[PDB]
Design a protein around this motif. Sequence first.
Motif, mmCIF file in Angstrom:
data_model
loop_
_atom_site.group_PDB
_atom_site.id
_atom_site.type_symbol
_atom_site.label_atom_id
_atom_site.label_comp_id
_atom_site.label_asym_id
_atom_site.label_seq_id
_atom_site.Cartn_x
_atom_site.Cartn_y
_atom_site.Cartn_z
ATOM 1 N N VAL B 12 0.827 -1.225 0.000
ATOM 2 C CA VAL B 12 0.000 0.000 0.000
ATOM 3 C C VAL B 12 0.857 1.268 0.000
ATOM 4 C CG1 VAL B 12 -2.045 1.134 0.982
ATOM 5 C CG2 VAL B 12 -1.734 -1.288 1.343
ATOM 6 N N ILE B 13 0.462 2.255 -0.806
ATOM 7 C CA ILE B 13 1.132 3.549 -0.984
ATOM 8 C C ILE B 13 0.117 4.691 -1.049
ATOM 9 C CG2 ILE B 13 3.283 2.692 -2.017
ATOM 10 C CD1 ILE B 13 1.946 3.579 -4.798
ATOM 11 N N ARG B 14 0.599 5.922 -0.878
ATOM 12 C CA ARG B 14 -0.142 7.150 -1.176
ATOM 13 C C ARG B 14 -0.558 7.127 -2.655
ATOM 14 N NH1 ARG B 14 0.595 12.904 0.744
ATOM 15 N NH2 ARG B 14 -0.487 13.814 -0.978
ATOM 16 N N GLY B 15 -1.732 7.628 -3.031
ATOM 17 C CA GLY B 15 -2.078 7.760 -4.458
ATOM 18 C C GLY B 15 -1.078 8.633 -5.233
ATOM 19 N N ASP B 16 -0.601 9.704 -4.605
ATOM 20 C CA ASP B 16 0.485 10.550 -5.105
ATOM 21 C C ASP B 16 1.863 9.850 -5.178
ATOM 22 O OD1 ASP B 16 -1.562 12.410 -3.277
ATOM 23 O OD2 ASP B 16 -0.908 13.576 -5.008
ATOM 24 N N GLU B 17 1.996 8.577 -4.793
ATOM 25 C CA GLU B 17 3.206 7.751 -4.999
ATOM 26 C C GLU B 17 3.103 6.749 -6.170
ATOM 27 O OE1 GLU B 17 3.634 6.637 -0.825
ATOM 28 O OE2 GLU B 17 4.532 8.584 -0.393
ATOM 29 N N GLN B 20 5.774 6.841 -8.920
ATOM 30 C CA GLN B 20 7.100 6.300 -8.602
ATOM 31 C C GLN B 20 7.225 4.806 -8.935
ATOM 32 O OE1 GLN B 20 9.007 7.464 -4.930
ATOM 33 N NE2 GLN B 20 7.741 9.196 -4.576
ATOM 34 N N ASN B 48 -7.494 3.100 -5.612
ATOM 35 C CA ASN B 48 -7.918 3.684 -4.360
ATOM 36 C C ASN B 48 -8.715 2.670 -3.532
ATOM 37 O OD1 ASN B 48 -8.529 5.473 -2.347
ATOM 38 N ND2 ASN B 48 -9.642 6.890 -3.602
#
Lengths: 48, 48
Positions: B12-17, B20, B48
């Motif tokens: 799991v990551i930030r949507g803004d990641e 990357q 999401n």
Amino acid sequence: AISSVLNDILSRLDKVEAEVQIDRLITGRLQSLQTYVTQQLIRAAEIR
Amino acid sequence: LCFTNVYADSFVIRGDEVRQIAPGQTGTIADYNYKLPDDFTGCVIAWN
């Protein structure tokens, strides 16, 4: 390419963009040796 | 198609990641906790 100097390009671009800029210099350079060696194989044939 | 071997890398990551996770990247994920190779063959699936 953004420079003639191969190290400068590494110092400004990643493995995906350096590959584009460097492949111009490889293609153009390799075309230079394929040119000179053709002129020389021909020149040599005159000398024979 | 058929494949020699397959994996699923799960996290799991930030949507803004999500950006990357593409191959040929830099940023704190791409640098310090998940990098893809240049020759990366595979798919990034993100939601999401």
